[PDB]
């Protein structure tokens, strides 16, 4: 039964900082990128759609253009880490990490952004 976990389900970050939000999946021996799907979304906004070892950038909500990246050197340790640079007040909310590798699972992470001073 394929399980996604999250070591932190709540991040409190400063406005304008960078943040990396993690979700974990099981990996063994080989990781065929051909079969791996990593999806990040928040509300109705696609952040990352990673299919065949390639981020697809046509689908990515405009608010996250040039700010959102999957850390792919991490996939091999079973880490699907979303990095967001220049955190905005609108980045606050509920994120979902979906990962498929023979069947699938998703977890929720809450981000809260402290406004300046």
């Amino acid at each position: 039964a394929f399980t996604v976990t999250v070591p932190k389900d709540l991040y409190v970050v400063e406005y304008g900082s960078n943040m990396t939000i993690e979700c974990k999946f099981p990996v063994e021996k080989q990781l065929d990128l051909a079969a791996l799907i990593v999806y990040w979304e928040m509300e109705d906004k696609n952040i990352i759609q990673f299919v065949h070892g390639e981020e697809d950038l046509k689908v990515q909500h405009s608010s996250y253009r040039q700010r959102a990246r999957l850390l792919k050197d991490q996939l091999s340790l079973g880490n699907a880490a979303l990095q967001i640079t220049d955190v905005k007040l609108q980045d606050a909310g509920v994120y979902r990490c979906m990962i498929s590798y023979g069947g699938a699972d998703y977890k929720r992470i809450t981000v809260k952004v402290n406004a300046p001073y």
Binding site: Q49, K58, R96, M98, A104, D105, Y106
Partner: peptide
């Protein structure tokens, strides 16, 4: 795209 349901949340392509 495909479309996936996990514990009553769905996920599609672009």
């Amino acid at each position: 795209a495909f479309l996936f349901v996990i514990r009553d949340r769905v996920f599609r392509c672009g």
